[PDB]
Amino acid sequence: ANPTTIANEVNTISTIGFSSEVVRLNYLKLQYKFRHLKQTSEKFYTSDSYIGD
């Protein structure tokens, strides 16, 4: 509220309030799967310029 004038005698005064806020950050874990050639099978797919099918 508006501040109080201090004149003569008074004990009822306007107040200053306080507050706290908690901010929360969420972290999420995600995954992907992909297919590939097995290590030991690469020699049977090696070509002149590349490796693969």
Place this chain on the structure above:
Amino acid sequence: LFDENYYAKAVANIIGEVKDPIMYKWFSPDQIEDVDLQMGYQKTVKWDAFLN
């Protein structure tokens, strides 16, 4: 070879006096890569990935 081939020796000596081509200014150093082929064809493969 140079003891027996004067033309080869002379080419080796005078090759330095030839100036660089002007095509080099049109490309960046990473955009030029030599291949080993005189005449014929050479295929290249580009691989891509996508999210499904």
